[PDB]
Amino acid sequence: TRQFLIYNEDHKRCVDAVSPSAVQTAACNQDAESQKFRWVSESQIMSVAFKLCLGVPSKTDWVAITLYACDSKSEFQKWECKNDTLLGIKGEDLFFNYGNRQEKNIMLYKGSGLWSRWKIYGTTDNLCSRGYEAMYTLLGNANGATCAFPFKFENKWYADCTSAGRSDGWLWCGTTTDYDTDKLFGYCPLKFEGSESLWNKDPLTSVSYQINSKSALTWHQARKSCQQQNAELLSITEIHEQTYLTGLTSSLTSGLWIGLNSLSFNSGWQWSDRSPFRYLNWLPGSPSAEPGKSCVSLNPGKNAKWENLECVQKLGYICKKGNTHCPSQWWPYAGHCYKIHRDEKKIQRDALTTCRKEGGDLTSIHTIEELDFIISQLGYEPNDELWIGLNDIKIQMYFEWSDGTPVTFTKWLRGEPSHENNRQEDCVVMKGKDGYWADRGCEWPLGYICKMKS
């Protein structure tokens, strides 16, 4: 999945490593470790056989590309893909090239020709396709630091995650390159027997959860460490979910990252996996109005309630592997009919009824296309404040639609949802050039939109 064979279409022969002194080409053989290569940084390319990166003595022409000890900053081991199948050194237009058979060796040339076009064996998406992605460790003493390749364990070099020196066959990696000295390690987000014992799956939902309490990453590092596990940062969508994870995080104390954030500039709080932000559970004082704050943490030491901590703080994190014809005045969309009212302005409750006396209900919105229809086609204007069907009248911090349709979709105005800990009941308005939503006390009289079926 991450190792590959470097290969030249025209010569139909792959790149091979015979020695640190010499890098040649041979007949392609994917069972020959000599030939196998693998990214290690954004730029470096290492041989899994010898655990050394391909590099040059200088950025000059016709010098031999050979294997050097791999070095984050030696700026001769750095490579990049140009034009397409081109492979050259960064900064200077000099390219990986097939070796003139005088010096049996890959060399660096200035020709953008057919001898300088390389490509992963058995594919057509250039070698910056299988590019390096930093893989954050699980558990371990290194607090989830990224894997370091290569690393030395018991005086041998390992090019990927290994189950060496272990009875259990788990896959681990050093987080520095000399693990034998620093002894910092963790487990790789890959699949092996024991892999799944790092998740919980609530017996009811079947959604799974990973609690990384011993790690300490920024919000964005955390988010990337669940995407590479085909997951995402934790979303809390139902009252059952918050209680279930309050049980898991009962015995923990330091804050943990969840997917709730205000990182988009014309949009309020939102879940990182695009789950609808319908259920709230803030700590007193949050959402804090401090302008620099956009990422939410879950505090297991304060009954699993939520607070926003700078997205550069290094905390733990939780991941989540889920899974026609209408009355006059009224206008249709998606089989329903809509209307905005300002003849008389009414309280939320009295607005709800004049949409049932009219034969419908305060409007529900389940898709962004639906929200788009409301603002374009019903004479709505950007400086409006219109009641809609969202509310938490039965249960605070739990928004449902008045018409009893499921809340499949959220789109908050920036700054919103407002002050819920400052009131007892939370109704929802539509306002702003984009028609985004805001929550407020219900017992405020405003205009409204309603929705009916045909």
Side-chain angles (χ1 to χ4, degrees):
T1 300
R2 298 176 300 286
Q3 296 179 11
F4 53 82
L5 274 188
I6 315 176
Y7 168 102
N8 188 246
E9 232 203 320
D10 182 73
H11 276 270
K12 50 85 162 201
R13 290 216 310 169
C14 294
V15 168
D16 191 356
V18 278
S19 95
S21 324
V23 175
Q24 272 143 42
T25 82
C28 298
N29 180 16
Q30 314 179 268
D31 312 342
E33 174 175 78
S34 320
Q35 311 189 16
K36 302 182 184 149
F37 290 85
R38 171 243 165 95
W39 290 88
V40 154
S41 148
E42 191 178 1
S43 321
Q44 293 135 51
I45 302 161
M46 178 245 282
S47 159
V48 317
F50 299 110
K51 292 92 192 171
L52 304 134
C53 299
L54 300 137
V56 298
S58 52
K59 306 151 139 169
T60 48
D61 199 352
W62 210 253
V63 305
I65 299 163
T66 39
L67 301 177
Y68 300 66
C70 291
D71 175 16
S72 149
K73 208 40 49 204
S74 151
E75 226 144 59
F76 306 125
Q77 322 193 269
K78 307 211 163 313
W79 304 89
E80 80 185 351
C81 316
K82 295 224 254 216
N83 208 231
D84 190 54
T85 37
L86 212 33
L87 180 48
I89 292 264
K90 202 195 275 229
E92 298 314 311
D93 281 78
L94 318 189
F95 311 128
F96 219 84
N97 195 93
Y98 200 101
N100 155 39
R101 289 300 111 182
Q102 282 193 221
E103 301 132 331
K104 271 215 92 73
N105 199 86
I106 296 305
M107 311 197 20
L108 183 72
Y109 194 69
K110 47 193 158 59
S112 36
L114 271 203
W115 290 23
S116 317
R117 316 258 150 172
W118 303 91
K119 190 38 200 154
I120 294 158
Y121 188 26
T123 88
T124 67
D125 319 60
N126 65 60
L127 283 90
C128 294
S129 74
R130 296 206 194 167
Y132 172 77
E133 184 199 5
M135 76 159 36
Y136 302 78
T137 38
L138 302 188
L139 296 197
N141 44 26
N143 298 139
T146 53
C147 284
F149 300 110
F151 64 91
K152 187 209 314 155
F153 155 73
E154 292 204 333
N155 288 331
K156 292 218 87 149
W157 293 89
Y158 294 93
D160 207 290
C161 310
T162 179
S163 89
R166 283 282 286 289
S167 315
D168 47 31
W170 287 36
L171 292 188
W172 67 279
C173 88
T175 61
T176 72
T177 47
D178 187 12
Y179 162 87
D180 275 332
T181 299
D182 319 314
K183 53 202 218 190
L184 310 197
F185 85 107
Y187 295 90
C188 300
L190 304 156
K191 308 70 210 181
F192 54 90
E193 34 250 49
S195 161
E196 288 301 334
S197 34
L198 278 93
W199 299 81
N200 216 41
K201 178 153 68 169
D202 156 47
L204 183 78
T205 36
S206 80
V207 172
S208 273
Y209 302 96
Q210 193 191 69
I211 312 276
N212 307 301
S213 50
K214 296 198 303 173
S215 295
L217 322 167
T218 186
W219 189 84
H220 298 89
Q221 280 170 317
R223 177 170 191 198
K224 287 180 237 165
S225 171
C226 318
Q227 296 172 335
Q228 49 178 282
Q229 317 201 56
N230 300 115
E232 174 77 44
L233 279 191
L234 169 69
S235 61
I236 309 271
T237 47
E238 312 268 17
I239 312 181
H240 163 70
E241 203 153 33
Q242 171 71 77
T243 37
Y244 177 77
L245 304 173
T246 306
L248 281 178
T249 71
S250 85
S251 36
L252 299 173
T253 324
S254 323
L256 274 43
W257 282 123
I258 63 186
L260 182 58
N261 67 83
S262 39
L263 287 169
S264 279
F265 180 54
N266 213 42
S267 309
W269 301 94
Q270 42 170 37
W271 288 110
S272 95
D273 57 1
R274 315 182 58 45
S275 287
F277 186 46
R278 65 161 310 175
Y279 171 71
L280 284 61
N281 194 230
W282 291 111
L283 270 175
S286 324
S288 154
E290 306 198 41
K293 185 61 226 79
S294 301
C295 299
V296 184
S297 156
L298 177 139
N299 196 325
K302 285 178 182 153
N303 237 24
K305 287 198 164 190
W306 309 342
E307 60 177 345
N308 39 359
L309 298 189
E310 301 136 74
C311 316
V312 201
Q313 301 200 20
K314 313 234 286 286
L315 321 168
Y317 56 114
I318 299 167
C319 308
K320 182 174 163 188
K321 200 158 33 158
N323 282 227
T324 174
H325 213 88
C326 305
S328 149
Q329 296 293 34
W330 294 58
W331 293 101
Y333 165 81
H336 288 239
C337 326
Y338 303 74
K339 172 171 253 44
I340 290 147
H341 291 264
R342 30 215 180 208
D343 44 304
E344 205 218 11
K345 35 160 97 142
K346 323 182 93 203
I347 319 94
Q348 190 266 12
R349 258 102 165 191
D350 296 354
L352 172 49
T353 52
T354 324
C355 302
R356 317 191 137 166
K357 299 167 76 164
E358 292 250 33
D361 199 328
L362 274 186
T363 177
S364 195
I365 324 187
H366 314 102
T367 63
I368 178 70
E369 294 89 343
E370 192 177 19
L371 174 69
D372 171 56
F373 163 85
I374 297 178
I375 52 177
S376 324
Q377 303 278 78
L378 317 165
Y380 159 90
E381 279 183 11
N383 54 344
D384 258 331
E385 220 181 336
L386 299 188
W387 280 129
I388 65 161
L390 201 66
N391 74 94
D392 67 348
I393 300 184
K394 320 178 215 169
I395 310 277
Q396 225 189 352
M397 318 293 102
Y398 193 69
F399 289 93
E400 35 206 346
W401 292 111
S402 65
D403 58 16
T405 65
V407 189
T408 53
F409 175 79
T410 320
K411 281 306 151 246
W412 289 119
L413 207 74
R414 185 73 169 176
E416 296 288 336
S418 34
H419 322 327
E420 302 85 28
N421 325 91
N422 199 261
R423 49 174 123 77
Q424 285 296 303
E425 283 182 350
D426 307 306
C427 287
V428 166
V429 291
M430 222 192 63
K431 63 184 301 186
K433 73 182 182 284
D434 309 273
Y436 296 155
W437 309 342
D439 77 321
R440 65 173 317 168
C442 296
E443 232 184 269
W444 284 101
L446 311 144
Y448 42 104
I449 325 172
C450 35
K451 183 180 164 174
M452 89 168 48
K453 176 46 128 152
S454 268

Coordinates of all heavy atoms in Angstrom, one line a residue, residues 78-142:
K78 N 16.2 15.3 -1.4 CA 14.8 15.8 -1.6 C 14.4 15.7 -3.0 O 15.2 16.1 -3.9 CB 14.6 17.2 -1.1 CG 15.1 17.4 0.3 CD 14.3 18.5 1.0 CE 14.5 18.5 2.5 NZ 14.3 17.1 3.0
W79 N 13.2 15.2 -3.3 CA 12.8 15.0 -4.6 C 11.3 15.5 -4.8 O 10.6 15.7 -3.8 CB 12.8 13.5 -5.0 CG 14.2 12.8 -4.9 CD1 14.7 12.2 -3.8 CD2 15.2 12.8 -5.9 NE1 15.9 11.8 -4.0 CE2 16.3 12.1 -5.3 CE3 15.3 13.2 -7.2 CZ2 17.4 11.8 -6.1 CZ3 16.4 12.9 -7.9 CH2 17.5 12.2 -7.4
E80 N 10.9 15.6 -6.0 CA 9.6 16.1 -6.3 C 9.2 15.7 -7.7 O 10.1 15.3 -8.5 CB 9.6 17.7 -6.2 CG 10.1 18.4 -7.4 CD 10.2 19.9 -7.3 OE1 9.7 20.4 -6.2 OE2 10.8 20.6 -8.1
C81 N 7.9 15.7 -8.0 CA 7.4 15.3 -9.3 C 7.0 16.5 -10.1 O 6.3 17.3 -9.6 CB 6.3 14.3 -9.2 SG 6.5 12.9 -8.0
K82 N 7.5 16.6 -11.3 CA 7.1 17.7 -12.2 C 6.4 17.1 -13.5 O 6.4 15.9 -13.7 CB 8.4 18.5 -12.6 CG 9.1 19.2 -11.4 CD 9.5 20.6 -11.7 CE 11.0 20.7 -11.9 NZ 11.5 22.0 -11.3
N83 N 6.0 18.1 -14.3 CA 5.3 17.8 -15.6 C 4.3 16.6 -15.5 O 3.1 16.8 -15.8 CB 6.3 17.4 -16.6 CG 5.9 17.8 -18.1 OD1 5.9 16.9 -19.0 ND2 5.4 19.0 -18.2
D84 N 4.7 15.4 -15.0 CA 3.9 14.3 -14.7 C 4.7 13.2 -14.2 O 5.0 13.1 -13.0 CB 3.0 13.8 -15.8 CG 2.0 12.8 -15.4 OD1 1.2 13.1 -14.5 OD2 1.9 11.7 -16.0
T85 N 5.2 12.3 -15.1 CA 6.1 11.2 -14.7 C 7.5 11.7 -14.5 O 8.4 10.9 -14.4 CB 6.1 10.1 -15.8 OG1 6.0 10.7 -17.1 CG2 4.9 9.2 -15.5
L86 N 7.8 13.0 -14.5 CA 9.1 13.5 -14.3 C 9.4 13.4 -12.8 O 8.5 13.6 -12.0 CB 9.2 15.0 -14.7 CG 10.5 15.6 -15.3 CD1 11.3 14.5 -16.0 CD2 10.3 16.8 -16.1
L87 N 10.6 13.0 -12.5 CA 11.1 13.0 -11.1 C 12.5 13.8 -11.0 O 13.5 13.3 -11.6 CB 11.3 11.5 -10.7 CG 11.8 11.4 -9.2 CD1 11.0 12.2 -8.3 CD2 11.8 9.9 -8.8
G88 N 12.4 14.9 -10.4 CA 13.7 15.7 -10.2 C 13.8 16.2 -8.8 O 13.0 16.1 -8.0
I89 N 15.0 16.8 -8.6 CA 15.4 17.4 -7.4 C 14.7 18.7 -7.2 O 14.4 19.4 -8.2 CB 17.0 17.6 -7.3 CG1 17.7 16.2 -7.2 CG2 17.4 18.5 -6.1 CD1 18.0 15.8 -5.8
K90 N 14.4 19.1 -6.0 CA 13.6 20.3 -5.7 C 14.5 21.5 -5.9 O 15.7 21.5 -5.5 CB 13.0 20.3 -4.3 CG 11.8 21.2 -4.2 CD 11.5 21.5 -2.7 CE 10.6 20.4 -2.1 NZ 9.4 20.9 -1.4
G91 N 14.0 22.6 -6.5 CA 14.7 23.8 -6.7 C 15.5 24.0 -8.0 O 15.5 25.1 -8.5
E92 N 16.1 22.9 -8.5 CA 16.8 22.9 -9.7 C 16.2 21.9 -10.7 O 15.8 20.8 -10.3 CB 18.3 22.6 -9.5 CG 19.0 23.6 -8.6 CD 18.8 25.0 -9.0 OE1 18.9 25.3 -10.2 OE2 18.5 25.8 -8.1
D93 N 16.1 22.3 -12.0 CA 15.5 21.5 -13.0 C 16.5 20.4 -13.5 O 16.9 20.3 -14.6 CB 15.1 22.3 -14.2 CG 13.8 23.1 -14.0 OD1 13.9 24.1 -13.3 OD2 12.8 22.7 -14.5
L94 N 16.8 19.5 -12.5 CA 17.6 18.3 -12.8 C 16.9 17.1 -12.3 O 16.3 17.1 -11.2 CB 19.0 18.4 -12.2 CG 19.8 19.8 -12.2 CD1 21.3 19.5 -11.7 CD2 19.9 20.4 -13.6
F95 N 17.0 16.0 -13.1 CA 16.0 14.9 -13.0 C 16.7 13.6 -12.7 O 17.7 13.3 -13.2 CB 15.2 14.9 -14.3 CG 14.6 16.2 -14.7 CD1 14.8 16.6 -16.0 CD2 13.9 17.0 -13.8 CE1 14.3 17.9 -16.4 CE2 13.4 18.2 -14.2 CZ 13.6 18.7 -15.5
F96 N 16.0 12.8 -11.9 CA 16.2 11.3 -11.9 C 16.3 10.9 -13.4 O 15.5 11.2 -14.2 CB 15.0 10.6 -11.3 CG 15.3 9.4 -10.4 CD1 15.7 9.6 -9.1 CD2 15.2 8.1 -10.9 CE1 16.1 8.5 -8.3 CE2 15.6 7.0 -10.2 CZ 16.0 7.2 -8.9
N97 N 17.4 10.1 -13.7 CA 17.6 9.7 -15.0 C 18.1 8.2 -15.1 O 18.9 7.8 -14.2 CB 18.5 10.6 -15.8 CG 18.5 10.4 -17.3 OD1 17.8 11.1 -18.0 ND2 19.3 9.5 -17.8
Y98 N 17.8 7.5 -16.1 CA 18.3 6.2 -16.4 C 19.8 6.3 -16.6 O 20.3 7.3 -17.1 CB 17.7 5.6 -17.7 CG 17.8 4.1 -17.8 CD1 16.8 3.3 -17.4 CD2 19.0 3.5 -18.2 CE1 16.9 1.9 -17.5 CE2 19.1 2.2 -18.3 CZ 18.1 1.4 -18.0 OH 18.2 0.0 -18.1
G99 N 20.6 5.3 -16.1 CA 22.0 5.4 -16.2 C 22.6 5.0 -17.5 O 22.3 3.9 -18.0
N100 N 23.4 5.8 -18.0 CA 24.3 5.4 -19.1 C 25.1 4.2 -18.7 O 25.7 4.2 -17.6 CB 25.2 6.6 -19.5 CG 26.5 6.1 -20.2 OD1 26.5 5.2 -21.0 ND2 27.6 6.7 -19.8
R101 N 25.1 3.1 -19.5 CA 25.6 1.9 -19.0 C 27.2 1.9 -18.9 O 27.8 0.9 -18.7 CB 25.2 0.7 -19.9 CG 23.7 0.4 -19.7 CD 23.3 0.0 -18.2 NE 22.5 1.0 -17.6 CZ 22.1 1.0 -16.3 NH1 22.5 0.0 -15.5 NH2 21.4 2.0 -15.8
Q102 N 27.8 3.1 -19.0 CA 29.2 3.2 -18.6 C 29.4 3.1 -17.1 O 30.0 2.3 -16.5 CB 29.9 4.5 -19.2 CG 30.2 4.4 -20.6 CD 31.1 5.6 -21.1 OE1 30.9 6.2 -22.1 NE2 32.1 5.9 -20.2
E103 N 28.7 4.0 -16.4 CA 28.5 4.0 -15.0 C 27.2 3.3 -14.7 O 26.2 3.9 -14.7 CB 28.5 5.4 -14.3 CG 29.8 6.2 -14.6 CD 29.4 7.6 -15.1 OE1 28.4 7.8 -15.7 OE2 30.2 8.5 -14.9
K104 N 27.3 2.0 -14.5 CA 26.1 1.2 -14.1 C 25.4 1.8 -12.9 O 25.7 1.4 -11.7 CB 26.4 -0.3 -13.9 CG 26.4 -1.1 -15.1 CD 25.8 -2.5 -14.8 CE 24.3 -2.6 -14.9 NZ 23.9 -2.6 -16.3
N105 N 24.6 2.9 -13.1 CA 24.1 3.6 -11.9 C 23.1 4.6 -12.4 O 23.2 5.2 -13.5 CB 25.2 4.4 -11.2 CG 24.8 4.8 -9.8 OD1 24.9 4.0 -8.9 ND2 24.3 6.0 -9.7
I106 N 22.0 4.8 -11.6 CA 21.1 5.9 -11.8 C 21.8 7.2 -11.6 O 22.7 7.3 -10.8 CB 19.9 5.8 -10.8 CG1 19.1 4.5 -11.0 CG2 19.0 7.0 -10.8 CD1 18.6 4.4 -12.4
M107 N 21.6 8.1 -12.5 CA 22.3 9.4 -12.4 C 21.3 10.6 -12.6 O 20.1 10.4 -13.0 CB 23.4 9.5 -13.4 CG 24.3 8.3 -13.3 SD 25.9 8.5 -14.1 CE 26.0 10.3 -14.1
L108 N 21.8 11.8 -12.4 CA 21.1 13.0 -12.4 C 21.4 13.8 -13.6 O 22.6 14.1 -13.8 CB 21.3 13.8 -11.1 CG 20.6 15.2 -10.9 CD1 19.1 14.9 -10.6 CD2 21.2 16.0 -9.8
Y109 N 20.4 14.1 -14.5 CA 20.7 14.7 -15.8 C 19.7 15.8 -16.0 O 18.7 16.0 -15.3 CB 20.5 13.6 -16.9 CG 21.0 13.9 -18.2 CD1 22.3 14.0 -18.5 CD2 20.1 14.1 -19.3 CE1 22.8 14.4 -19.7 CE2 20.6 14.5 -20.6 CZ 21.9 14.6 -20.8 OH 22.4 14.9 -22.0
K110 N 20.0 16.6 -17.0 CA 19.2 17.8 -17.3 C 18.1 17.6 -18.3 O 17.3 18.5 -18.6 CB 20.0 19.0 -17.7 CG 21.0 18.8 -18.8 CD 22.1 19.9 -18.9 CE 23.4 19.5 -19.6 NZ 23.2 18.9 -20.9
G111 N 18.1 16.4 -18.9 CA 17.1 16.0 -20.0 C 15.7 15.6 -19.5 O 15.6 14.7 -18.7
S112 N 14.7 16.3 -20.0 CA 13.4 16.0 -19.7 C 12.8 14.9 -20.6 O 11.6 14.9 -21.0 CB 12.5 17.2 -19.7 OG 12.9 18.1 -20.7
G113 N 13.7 14.0 -21.0 CA 13.3 13.0 -22.0 C 12.7 11.7 -21.4 O 12.4 11.6 -20.2
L114 N 12.6 10.7 -22.3 CA 12.0 9.4 -22.0 C 12.8 8.6 -21.0 O 12.3 7.6 -20.4 CB 11.8 8.6 -23.2 CG 10.5 8.7 -24.1 CD1 10.4 7.4 -24.9 CD2 9.3 8.9 -23.2
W115 N 14.1 8.9 -20.8 CA 15.0 8.3 -19.9 C 14.8 8.9 -18.5 O 15.5 8.4 -17.5 CB 16.4 8.3 -20.4 CG 16.6 7.3 -21.5 CD1 15.6 6.9 -22.4 CD2 17.8 6.7 -22.0 NE1 16.1 6.1 -23.3 CE2 17.5 5.9 -23.1 CE3 19.1 6.7 -21.5 CZ2 18.4 5.1 -23.8 CZ3 20.0 5.9 -22.2 CH2 19.7 5.2 -23.3
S116 N 14.1 10.0 -18.4 CA 13.9 10.7 -17.1 C 12.4 10.7 -16.7 O 12.1 11.5 -15.8 CB 14.4 12.2 -17.2 OG 15.6 12.2 -17.9
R117 N 11.6 9.8 -17.2 CA 10.3 9.6 -16.8 C 10.1 8.3 -16.1 O 10.3 7.2 -16.7 CB 9.3 9.7 -18.0 CG 9.6 10.8 -19.0 CD 8.7 12.0 -18.8 NE 9.4 13.2 -19.2 CZ 8.7 14.4 -19.3 NH1 7.4 14.5 -19.1 NH2 9.4 15.5 -19.7
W118 N 9.7 8.3 -14.8 CA 9.6 7.2 -14.0 C 8.2 7.0 -13.5 O 7.4 8.0 -13.6 CB 10.6 7.2 -12.8 CG 12.0 7.4 -13.3 CD1 12.7 8.6 -13.5 CD2 12.9 6.4 -13.6 NE1 14.0 8.3 -13.9 CE2 14.1 7.0 -13.9 CE3 12.9 5.0 -13.5 CZ2 15.3 6.2 -14.3 CZ3 14.0 4.2 -13.9 CH2 15.2 4.9 -14.3
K119 N 7.9 5.9 -12.9 CA 6.5 5.6 -12.6 C 6.3 4.3 -11.8 O 7.1 3.4 -12.0 CB 5.7 5.5 -14.0 CG 4.2 5.5 -13.8 CD 3.9 6.4 -12.7 CE 2.5 6.1 -12.2 NZ 2.4 6.5 -10.8
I120 N 5.3 4.3 -10.9 CA 5.1 3.2 -10.0 C 4.8 2.0 -10.8 O 3.9 2.0 -11.7 CB 4.1 3.5 -8.9 CG1 4.5 4.6 -8.0 CG2 3.7 2.3 -8.1 CD1 3.4 5.3 -7.3
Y121 N 5.4 0.9 -10.5 CA 5.2 -0.4 -11.3 C 3.7 -0.8 -11.2 O 3.2 -0.9 -10.1 CB 6.1 -1.5 -10.7 CG 6.2 -2.7 -11.5 CD1 5.9 -2.8 -12.9 CD2 6.5 -3.9 -10.9 CE1 5.9 -4.0 -13.6 CE2 6.6 -5.1 -11.6 CZ 6.3 -5.1 -12.9 OH 6.3 -6.3 -13.7
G122 N 3.1 -1.1 -12.3 CA 1.8 -1.5 -12.4 C 0.7 -0.4 -12.3 O -0.5 -0.8 -12.0
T123 N 1.1 0.8 -12.4 CA 0.1 1.9 -12.3 C 0.4 3.0 -13.3 O 1.2 2.8 -14.3 CB 0.2 2.6 -10.9 OG1 1.2 3.6 -10.9 CG2 0.5 1.5 -9.8
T124 N -0.3 4.2 -13.2 CA -0.1 5.3 -14.1 C -0.2 6.7 -13.4 O -0.2 7.7 -14.1 CB -1.1 5.3 -15.2 OG1 -2.5 5.5 -14.7 CG2 -1.1 4.0 -16.0
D125 N -0.3 6.7 -12.0 CA -0.4 7.9 -11.3 C 1.0 8.2 -10.6 O 1.3 7.6 -9.6 CB -1.5 7.8 -10.2 CG -2.8 7.2 -10.8 OD1 -2.7 6.0 -11.2 OD2 -3.9 7.8 -10.8
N126 N 1.7 9.2 -11.1 CA 3.1 9.4 -10.8 C 3.5 9.3 -9.3 O 2.7 9.5 -8.4 CB 3.6 10.8 -11.3 CG 2.8 12.0 -10.6 OD1 2.9 12.1 -9.4 ND2 2.2 12.8 -11.4
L127 N 4.8 9.1 -9.0 CA 5.3 8.6 -7.7 C 5.0 9.5 -6.6 O 5.2 9.2 -5.4 CB 6.8 8.4 -7.7 CG 7.4 7.1 -8.4 CD1 7.6 7.4 -9.8 CD2 8.6 6.7 -7.7
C128 N 4.5 10.7 -6.8 CA 3.9 11.6 -5.8 C 2.4 11.2 -5.5 O 1.7 12.0 -4.8 CB 4.0 13.1 -6.2 SG 5.7 13.7 -6.3
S129 N 1.9 10.1 -6.1 CA 0.6 9.6 -5.7 C 0.7 8.8 -4.4 O 0.0 9.1 -3.5 CB 0.1 8.7 -6.8 OG 0.7 7.5 -6.9
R130 N 1.6 7.8 -4.3 CA 1.8 7.1 -3.1 C 2.6 7.9 -2.1 O 3.6 7.4 -1.5 CB 2.4 5.7 -3.3 CG 1.5 4.8 -4.1 CD 1.8 3.3 -3.8 NE 1.2 2.4 -4.8 CZ 1.5 1.1 -5.0 NH1 2.4 0.6 -4.2 NH2 0.9 0.4 -5.9
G131 N 2.3 9.2 -2.0 CA 3.1 10.1 -1.2 C 3.1 9.8 0.3 O 2.2 9.1 0.8
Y132 N 4.1 10.4 1.0 CA 4.2 10.2 2.4 C 3.1 10.9 3.1 O 2.8 12.1 2.9 CB 5.6 10.6 2.9 CG 5.7 10.6 4.4 CD1 5.9 9.4 5.1 CD2 5.7 11.8 5.1 CE1 6.1 9.4 6.4 CE2 5.9 11.8 6.5 CZ 6.1 10.6 7.1 OH 6.2 10.6 8.5
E133 N 2.5 10.2 4.1 CA 1.5 10.8 5.0 C 2.0 10.4 6.4 O 2.3 9.2 6.7 CB 0.1 10.2 4.8 CG -1.0 10.9 5.6 CD -2.2 10.0 5.7 OE1 -2.2 8.9 5.1 OE2 -3.2 10.5 6.3
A134 N 2.2 11.4 7.3 CA 2.6 11.2 8.6 C 1.5 10.4 9.4 O 0.4 10.7 9.4 CB 2.9 12.5 9.4
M135 N 1.9 9.3 10.0 CA 1.0 8.4 10.7 C 1.3 8.5 12.2 O 2.4 8.1 12.6 CB 1.1 7.0 10.1 CG 2.3 6.1 10.5 SD 1.9 4.3 10.3 CE 0.9 4.4 8.8
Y136 N 0.3 9.0 12.9 CA 0.4 9.2 14.3 C 0.2 7.9 15.1 O -0.7 7.1 14.8 CB -0.7 10.2 14.8 CG -0.5 11.6 14.1 CD1 -1.0 11.8 12.8 CD2 0.0 12.7 14.8 CE1 -0.9 13.0 12.2 CE2 0.1 13.9 14.1 CZ -0.3 14.1 12.9 OH -0.2 15.3 12.2
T137 N 1.0 7.7 16.1 CA 1.0 6.4 16.8 C -0.2 6.3 17.8 O -0.8 7.3 18.1 CB 2.3 6.2 17.6 OG1 2.8 7.5 18.1 CG2 3.4 5.7 16.6
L138 N -0.4 5.1 18.2 CA -1.5 4.8 19.2 C -0.9 4.3 20.5 O 0.1 3.5 20.4 CB -2.5 3.8 18.6 CG -3.2 4.3 17.4 CD1 -4.3 3.4 17.0 CD2 -3.7 5.8 17.5
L139 N -1.4 4.7 21.6 CA -0.9 4.2 22.9 C 0.6 4.6 23.1 O 0.9 5.8 22.7 CB -1.2 2.8 23.0 CG -2.7 2.4 23.0 CD1 -2.9 1.0 23.5 CD2 -3.5 3.4 23.8
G140 N 1.4 3.7 23.6 CA 2.8 4.0 23.7 C 3.2 5.1 24.6 O 2.4 5.8 25.2
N141 N 4.5 5.3 24.8 CA 5.0 6.4 25.7 C 5.2 7.7 25.0 O 5.4 8.7 25.6 CB 6.3 5.9 26.3 CG 7.3 5.3 25.4 OD1 7.2 5.5 24.2 ND2 8.2 4.4 25.9
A142 N 5.2 7.7 23.6 CA 5.6 8.8 22.9 C 4.4 9.8 22.7 O 4.5 10.7 21.9 CB 6.1 8.4 21.5

